[PDB]
Amino acid sequence: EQLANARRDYEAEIARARQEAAKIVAQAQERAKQQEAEIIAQARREAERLKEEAR
C-alpha cells in the first residue's frame, strides 16, 4: 500500500520540489535585481563624480 500510494506521493513531492525551486528562483532574482540596482546607482554616482571633476 505504501508503494501504491507512494507513486502519487512522489509525484506530489516532485511538484512541491518544483514549487520550492520556483520560490528559490524568485528569491535569487530579487537579490540579483537588488545587486543590479546597486551597480546602476554606483555607476550613476561615478558619472556624477566624473562630471564634477571635469567641471
Place this chain on the structure above:
Amino acid sequence: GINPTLFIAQLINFLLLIFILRALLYRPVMNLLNERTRRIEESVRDAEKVR
C-alpha cells in the same frame, strides 16, 4: 481382532480419510503460494517506489 471384513472396512475408511486430507492439504498449498506471491509483490513494489 482378526477379520478380513474388518480389515477391508478399515482400509476403505482410511482411503476416504486420505481423500479428505488430500483436499485439506491442497487448500494449504494454495494459501502458502498466495502468501509468498503477496510478499514478493510487496518487496518489488517497495523497491520500485524507492527508486
